[PDB]
């Protein structure tokens, strides 16, 4: 009973860890169906269900399970469990766009972790809280940098939280956590218009990504670095990083990222006046969007091509893609 509930839960946890959350989830549900009198165990099952559903993009279900975990942690007086549940609720509320409540929940995680002198919990909570402010500021209007004071206020609060997180994970020797904070700090600086600061942080993220052999993180960092250099007016440097993202996108067989690399390269070459290089990268993007059935990107390819040919002289091909742009 209590024993086989635990046995099912362990198997659920094994499966999620190995990348099979679909299968692990239903072992968690079976565990709940069998049930147990150990409320610490039951709480942890609910939390792992919330985590599994979050990773499966069922945020509504994730929220409900974290809420049960939180409440149960309170009934038994488990402060550590209460703090972790509050952190998980906050991360979920953030994805759902409940930024105000996300802040409260993540602050609770932080406050309890400090009350208990749990430094690992404290660092996580600072990262999470930074993420909420980051997402909040990022949610305004047009994406990218430039509008309402609250945008800047939220992003600046995220910078302060990431900097404090980074200070703490350095003292803990947590390299992976440093990479994560550097990454998010860099994008936070980017959105604030602090482009030189974005570059410094993304370079650190890059270094740590290479250290772990984390190819996805490496790709992100190059892409983010390219973006920052575009806004610095250093277009040659951007093409370099955009090219490095392109290499890894191909090596990792990630077609969508492969397509975007080509489009941003086409635009960097447009800003560098090399219109022939622009066309080449645009048609490789156009083809890839036709492959992935992405109609929105397919439209952008046509419009960009028309503009480049116009600065070259080719009036005939400029009209050809304009008629293809109207169709989509």
């Amino acid at each position: 009973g209590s024993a086989s509930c635990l046995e099912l839960a362990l198997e659920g946890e094994r499966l999620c860890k190995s990348g099979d959350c679909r299968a692990g989830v239903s072992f968690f549900e079976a565990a709940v169906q069998v049930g147990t009198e150990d409320l610490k165990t039951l709480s942890a099952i609910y939390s792992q269900l919330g985590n599994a559903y979050f990773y499966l993009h069922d945020y509504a279900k994730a929220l409900e399970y974290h809420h049960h975990d939180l409440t149960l942690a309170r009934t038994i007086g488990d402060q550590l469990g209460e703090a972790k549940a509050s952190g998980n609720l906050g991360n979920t509320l953030k994805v759902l766009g409940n930024f105000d409540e996300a802040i409260v929940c993540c602050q609770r995680h932080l406050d309890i972790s400090r009350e208990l002198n749990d430094k690992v919990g404290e660092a996580r909570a600072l990262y999470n809280l930074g993420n909420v402010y980051h997402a909040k500021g990022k949610s305004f209007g047009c994406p990218g940098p430039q509008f309402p004071e609250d945008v800047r206020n939220a992003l600046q609060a995220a910078v302060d939280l990431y900097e404090e997180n980074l200070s703490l994970v350095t003292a803990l020797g947590d390299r992976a956590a440093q990479g994560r904070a550097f990454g998010n700090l860099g994008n936070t600086h980017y959105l604030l218009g602090n482009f030189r600061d974005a570059v410094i942080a993304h370079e650190q993220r890059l270094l740590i990504a290479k250290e772990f052999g984390d190819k996805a993180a490496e790709r992100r960092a190059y892409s983010n670095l390219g973006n920052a250099y575009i806004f610095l007016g250093e277009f040659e440097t951007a093409s370099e990083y955009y090219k490095k993202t392109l290499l890894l996108a191909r090596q990792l067989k990630d077609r969508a990222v492969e397509a975007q690399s080509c489009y941003s390269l086409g635009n960097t070459y447009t800003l560098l006046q090399d219109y022939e290089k622009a066309i080449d990268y645009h048609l490789k993007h156009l083809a890839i969007a036709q492959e992935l059935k992405d109609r929105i990107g397919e439209g952008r390819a046509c419009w960009s091509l028309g503009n480049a040919y116009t600065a070259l002289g080719n009036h005939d091909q400029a009209m050809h893609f304009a008629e293809k742009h109207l169709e989509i």
């Binding site: 635990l6 839960a9 362990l10 659920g12 946890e13 999620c16 860890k17 610490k40 165990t41 942890a44 099952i45 939390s47 792992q48 985590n51 979050f54 990773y55 972790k84 991360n91 994805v95 996580r124 980051h134 990022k138 994406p143 990218g144 994560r180 990454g183 998010n184 994008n187 980017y190 790709r219 992100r220 892409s223 983010n224 973006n227 575009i230 990222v257 975007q260 489009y263 941003s264 635009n267 952008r300």
Partner: peptide, 22 residues
């Protein structure tokens, strides 16, 4: 110009040993 999704850090879950540590 359009640059795609900003490429933020994916969400991080370091807690798949909880039940096993209980």
């Amino acid at each position: 110009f359009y640059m795609g999704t900003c490429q933020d850090e994916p969400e991080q879950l370091d807690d798949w040993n909880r039940i096993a540590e209980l």
